[PDB]
């Protein structure tokens, strides 16, 4: 395609990403070849786009290309490397090699890059009778010092090394470290730059987009490395990171493609928040009435009635949290088998703006599609934009199902009519 | 002595040092033993005293304990190490070992420590037909980024490594690098932490305090290493650093002793600014008269006269810059061979507050001492504090030389009389 | 001792004190002699160490050296001086004498000193049928204006005088005023600079360190002046000040000695927060089990069992607040009468980091010492640092009590073993 | 008049005064009666109007009501009070009485008031054989600390007391002190609040407004007190203060009346900057031509000619600084004896915007009025607003002098015509 077209395509993603925090967990093998040069350039570009950037790299594989290729075997109790004094010292050497390399590649492809004593570590201790030695986990992260650097526009570079109150240095696991730092920062995004195209489905295909539940159910039959990825990704989400992404940092330009295109390569994982929505039953009616009545009083919701609701309760859905009712919505059907109507949509005023409405509309379109409905109408006197911004197109009265058209005419309400087309 | 006494002794030096910038050039051998632990603690303390701190270390000796002890000989065209790709890579490893070590020693003896891509380097090129390879000299220092970190209270850590626009890393000479960074920052103080007690005199004794001229004349007969120290120290001073100090960072606690005691160990070098002061001659008189006359009009300076000055010109000194006269002072003598008087002290109003006065008083006490005078009087109607703050003690009229006592009585001026005791 | 040694001794206290707020309540007799010069110097030094400083002085004794020595007797309903218009006016004169004196002593031993209209006062009214006249108590303190000055580095000087909405000035009690200002600032430290070596015990000895409970029980048999000191000190602590100290500002250098040495002269008072820890009984077991079980599931705590706990309940302690259980710990004993083991230490995750653990360990060492135990072991797979940072030294398996050594061998857990030596 | 009218009258002066610095030198007798209450209220109001306020008071008269009324006579070598240790101590007492009084009066008529160690003093020494003792003059003012307080909105209160490096306090002369502080701040305004209606003319009348030259020539025959006022006022102006005002702080509301009405009570002194304007002669013509020619080329200035100028040189004025010509303007006359025209007005582009034009117009209206002209025309193609904003009203062609009307018609230029009426 054309430059202008590509750039106008990127523009909304640039808008979304600007001023947000991205923690990048970087596989240490990427900092070794000329994939390094490609990466510094793309990270330099991200810097230039107003993205706050914290980069953390791994060391394990480099240590093994020093260990294994020597006559010493690494031990990996839960993927956590046992790391002795000699391995610890190598990691310190590698971390300096790598930060220097990155800095040089960034200077030749002027972007401020900073590193500091941000992590305080503790040893993992003893996993399964096996002393883990210098394998440490982040005990405290200096969030104030980090924010202060990101705020000034600095790129933050972190090795997989933390120090302790006992004046020791510990070896950190990168995959776990990035997710920990990401949660501490409440980073909007965690990115793992791996050697893999992302997480694959049981049928072999690349999982473009996953819920944390979907991710979780895949780990049941997944290799060790990818199980740990998921575990860290899920804990990040649960800890407040908005989105976790898995990419192949060996695929030239994949970071740009992931962040700035609708399509995006790799795997994207996000947490589905908890909103129990269920078929309404008999006992819901007073809760539904109390919610609906103010609105029916205001001329926003059509007048219902204890009897209407009792005899049509099956067409209502209700949204609940801790026994508390907070929303409702009905699916009305017609002689036209293809047609449905979202009716009686309502969120308690105290619970609004937090997405509850959208979840009710979604649940009802799932229900509508479940029964063969490809066309979903909404009629509203005062609330038409909400629908128009969520996939509804203006429609005319002559377009309604015949019986609805008749109610509409005799109403006098002249409500706006919108239709959304539901895919098979 | 007692704690309270020691601490009250330190207090003025703490006051002087607070909020000032100190660049520490650190010999790489100090970061190797438990002298490291001692150093982090003392630097941590300096941090806590509101000193802005930039630390730079060397690598040469570590590289040789890797080179020489391998079967490769280092070459040192002007003390500048030829550094190939393999040596460059080692320096990157060492710099990571050392920054990690320092960070750990600082954490266990919470003080924010930061490092960044502050230096951009260029290669030295070819010294004397000898390709110097990866030996680079600082081309640009990011002074804004540095100030921003020091201002926030961060300790700044720098390796002896700069990068270039060509995406290469270069090996920097520490002694030269610190002096360059120090000038860029206009640091009040540069400290070299060496393995030596400082700079020695021709008679073998430690030069406690040196002018840059004194330092310069010592290099004539000095070993190579100490010649380079001086050269860098002198260029720092000439470049605006206020004071350069040389210490043995192997002498436990020497950094504290140097910064916070009157005595201070090690060598201190400062630049004597240019103030040509000479015996007045015949042709000076109009310049002297024009200066003196306003003051004599105001009742601050005793009335002189073209004839007085013509017949006493030999007792005047004058301070000049670019042919321009800016100050004068006279030495009056008495029948009491031990007694002198500083007379007719005056700095042009446009040239005041810049130390000119003090240099005139000093020059005259040097002249007074040259002729056997151990007691120097100053009489002033309005300017008595200036003398009292520069070593003069209140005296009485009955204490004057006899003939001066007589002039004083018949004057009516009742000027304050102060005496300073001049040492033999 | 040596300078370096003294200064390295001070360094941790300098670190702790930097950027903290200290409110100094100063007896007015200290501002009268050359103890004034000593004090300005030490307060100047504290300024230079990044301590935020609010100074308040008293006036009572000066007023009496004007009253009593005139033919007027002061009346002191609860140590609160009745203060008429004539006494009020003297206090205004004294406050100006004293602020000028202090300012001059500070300038000659450049440190910014500021004072302002920070206190608004109200009269105390009528104590016990006795009109108290111009004796006022702080009604409002301008905390924003105060913070603004401390933040800029200014020393804050306050007289014992507040003004009112009725355009009157009132006489404040210093001891009460400092404690009020200290609470308003949530100052980490309140210091009273008195003419006494601090608070004495019933046996005559100087109470180096007191809890607020200890302070309280001393007042039962204490002189009036010291009763009021305690009362104000205790209310400061209860109001959020971290530590209150009582010193003799007539003992040359005592402020430095108190703030910057382990030993410290004078009396230190701190509030013991509320943590009810008691012998576990039968009914605690479900609460203990629920806490312990997650941890035993994770391989951090040895598997217990409803029966184990039922038959060993006497060796458990539990920490509770509002009936809620938040922590537990057991003392295990051995055939070696000198040996104990802290077992089953656990704080609810929701209640962690707030010191609960430390209080459980302390309680158990108190229990261990109560039965003759001088050696206390801790064995931990993942939690060994916590112990090592709280006085435990690494030990070997051959060092365990014999039966514990046997369990340890057959476990397979390879837990780290640490010992703490308990003093008699 | 009406409130709305008064307030709309004040509005431009409020606009001018907002964010400006005013140093108020306050006679110590004003802080003694209920003139104090009036003053705090008016100063409180000024605070509320965004005026940055530095207040300094005197003490002399209070000291004499303590001296003279005791049996000790004050000595006043140049109006500078000899002040011994006993007088110095009284001044410290008075300064505290007075600051407390002011603070209380300000609180009861919430406005932040701050004072600090801003002045460092030196003794005056010996005037005329007379030791002046504790009479000190400001040696250094802490301008940074002062700006920092004014910037935060604080009112700054200063006593007439400075301290020295020798740990002494000195007695400052208020009149001199305010003018010194005012210059240090480059205050736009210095106000002296005296017991007099301002400076009187030789004919007895109150000098409403004076140049510094006018002020200077009045001192020739003026009382001592008013001579010193002038001397300080003039040195303030010369030192960069924009305006000095003298008022009676005993005239209820005079500070408001001076600052916020066109009329304003009291005396106002301002420095006439140096702009030598003289009759042009023969040798000026090339300088005039070079200036005029660019403009005549642009169609802004009517074409002149070496001959025109040679034969009309007497009607030109020229503005010069250091021999350099920077402006010119001509006065054209007509058969109508009442009519004049400002012709050929021009300032060198490099010297514009600095008031030169206005001074040329003024000089020519002075010349026009000197010969009986009450009507002054300006004709301009592109520059008509400049005139309209400096007192010119639009006029028509039928309104020109007859011969000018004829030139105007045949020109084709259609320049805008404006007239200013010159008062007799
Ligand atoms: C429209 C409604 C159901 C939305 O419920 P919700 O819980 O807020 O749903 P969401 O949080 O997913 O959507 C919230 C967004 O919808 C927008 N919105 C709400 N009412 C709107 C309206 N009347 N017109 C346009 N937009 C509206 C909100 O302003 C909010 O904007 P934001 O994305 O810029 O923050 C609303 O809460 C409601 O119940 N209104 C009265 C009942 C009603 O009108 N029902 C049905 C319409 S026929
Ligand atoms: C006193 C004088 C000679 C100082 O010359 P100088 O070039 O300023 O000398 P320095 O720069 O070394 O000293 C400057 C310091 O002296 C201080 N000083 C100057 N005059 C002073 C005085 N009259 N009283 C007290 N201190 C004074 C300045 O304020 C300045 O203070 P700082 O250290 O706080 O900045 C002054 O310039 C002068 O010539 N005054 C008139 C002549 C006179 O009085 N001569 C002789 C005295 S008998
Ligand atoms: C170790 C434990 C008992 C501490 O309880 P607590 O209520 O937090 O006790 P305190 O608040 O007095 O101590 C808190 C400090 O201990 C530190 N700490 C906690 N776990 C640690 C560990 N595993 N390793 C090192 N330090 C640790 C905390 O990080 C905190 O650090 P800070 O001083 O830097 O803030 C922890 O709460 C716990 O119960 N962990 C699981 C149970 C366990 O391991 N029990 C016994 C060990 S055999
Ligand atoms: C008009 C002129 C003589 C003003 O001289 P000057 O030295 O700037 O005079 P002042 O400094 O007293 O007045 C400066 C103010 O006049 C304003 N001014 C200048 N030219 C102006 C114009 N053409 N229209 C409106 N206002 C103008 C300036 O913008 C400045 O504005 P400020 O008060 O908002 O800063 C101008 O310099 C000049 O010589 N212009 C070309 C010659 C010309 O037009 N001459 C005569 C007019 S027939
Ligand atoms: N959508 C509203 C009715 C609005 C209308 O039909 O005008 C409801 O379901 O009650
Ligand atoms: N020191 C001044 C004279 C002052 C005096 O003697 O009173 C001078 O040398 O002229
Ligand atoms: N301290 C743990 C046991 C850990 C171990 O012995 O390895 C407990 O008391 O249960
Ligand atoms: N005022 C201009 C002439 C402009 C005009 O008359 O149009 C001059 O004096 O030359």
Automatic annotation (TrEMBL), chains A, B, C, D:
Source species of the chain: Neisseria gonorrhoeae (strain ATCC 700825 / FA 1090)
Main location, first listed in the record: cytoplasm
GO cellular component: cytoplasm
Entry annotated with the keyword Disulfide bond: no
Residues holding CoA 3: 352-355, 357-358, 383, 386
Signal peptide range: none
Keyword Glycosyltransferase: no
GO biological process: L-arginine biosynthetic process
Pathway assigned to this chain's UniProt record: Amino-acid biosynthesis; L-arginine biosynthesis; N(2)-acetyl-L-ornithine from L-glutamate: step 1/4
Keywords: Acyltransferase, Amino-acid biosynthesis, Arginine biosynthesis, Cytoplasm, Transferase
Database matches in NCBIfam families: N-Ac-Glu-synth (TIGR01890), PRK05279.1 (NF003641)
Single GO MF annotation: L-glutamate N-acetyltransferase activity
Record's catalysed reaction(s): L-glutamate + acetyl-CoA = N-acetyl-L-glutamate + CoA + H(+)
Family: Belongs to the acetyltransferase family. ArgA subfamily.
Protein name stated in the entry: Amino-acid acetyltransferase
PROSITE patterns (alphabetical): GNAT
Residues that coordinate or bind CoA 2: 353, 355, 357-358, 382, 385-386
Domain N-acetyltransferase: 275-424
Additional comment: In bacteria which possess the bifunctional enzyme ornithine acetyltransferase/N-acetylglutamate synthase (ArgJ), ArgA fulfills an anaplerotic role.
Localization, UniProt: Cytoplasm
The encoding gene: argA
Binding-site residues for L-glutamate, renumbered to this chain: 302, 304, 344, 379, 404, 413
Gene3D superfamilies: 3.40.630.30, Acetylglutamate kinase-like (3.40.1160.10)
């Amino acid at each position: 395609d054309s430059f202008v077209a590509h750039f106008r395509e990127a523009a909304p993603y640039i808008r979304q990403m600007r001023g947000t925090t991205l923690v990048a967990g970087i596989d240490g093998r990427l900092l070794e070849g000329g994939t390094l040069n490609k990466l510094a350039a793309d990270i330099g570009l991200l810097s230039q786009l107003g993205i706050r950037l914290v980069l953390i790299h791994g060391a394990y594989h480099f240590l093994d290309r020093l260990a294994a290729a020597q006559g010493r075997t690494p031990h990996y109790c839960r993927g956590l490397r046992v790391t002795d004094e000699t391995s610890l010292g190598q990691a310190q050497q590698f971390a300096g090699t790598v930060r220097s390399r990155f800095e040089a590649a960034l200077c030749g492809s002027s972007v401020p890059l900073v590193s500091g004593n941000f992590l305080t570590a503790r040893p993992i201790g003893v996993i399964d009778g096996t002393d883990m030695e210098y394998a440490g986990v982040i005990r405290k992260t200096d969030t104030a010092a980090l924010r202060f650097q990101l705020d000034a526009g600095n790129i933050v570079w972190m090795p997989p090394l933390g120090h302790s109150y006992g004046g020791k240095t510990f070896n950190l696991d990168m995959v776990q470290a990035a997710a920990s730092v990401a949660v501490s920062l409440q980073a909007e995004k965690l990115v793992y730059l791996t050697l893999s195209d992302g997480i694959s489905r049981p049928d072999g295909t690349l999982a473009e987009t996953l819920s944390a539940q979907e991710a979780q159910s895949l780990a049941e039959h997944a290799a060790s490395e990818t199980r740990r990825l998921i575990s860290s990704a899920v804990a990040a989400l649960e800890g407040g990171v908005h989105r976790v992404q898995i990419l192949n940092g060996a695929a030239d330009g994949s970071l740009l493609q992931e962040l700035f295109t609708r399509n995006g390569i790799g795997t994207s994982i996000a947490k589905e928040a908890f909103v129990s929505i269920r078929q309404a039953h008999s006992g819901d009616i007073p809760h539904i009435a109390a919610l609906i009545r103010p609105l029916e009083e205001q001329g926003i919701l059509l007048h219902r009635s204890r009897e209407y609701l009792e005899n049509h309760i099956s067409e209502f859905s209700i949204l609940e949290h801790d026994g508390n009712l907070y929303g409702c919505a009905a699916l009305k059907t017609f002689a036209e088998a293809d047609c449905g109507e979202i009716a009686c949509l309502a969120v308690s005023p105290q619970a609004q703006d937090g997405g509850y409405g959208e979840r009710l509309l979604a649940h009802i379109i799932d229900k509508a599609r479940g029964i063969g409905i490809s066309r979903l109408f909404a009629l509203s006197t005062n609330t038409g934009e909400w629908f128009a911004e969520r996939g509804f197109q203006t429609a005319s009265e002559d377009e309604l199902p015949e019986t609805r058209r008749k109610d509409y005419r005799s109403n006098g309400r002249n409500s706006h009519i919108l239709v959304r087309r539901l895919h098979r």
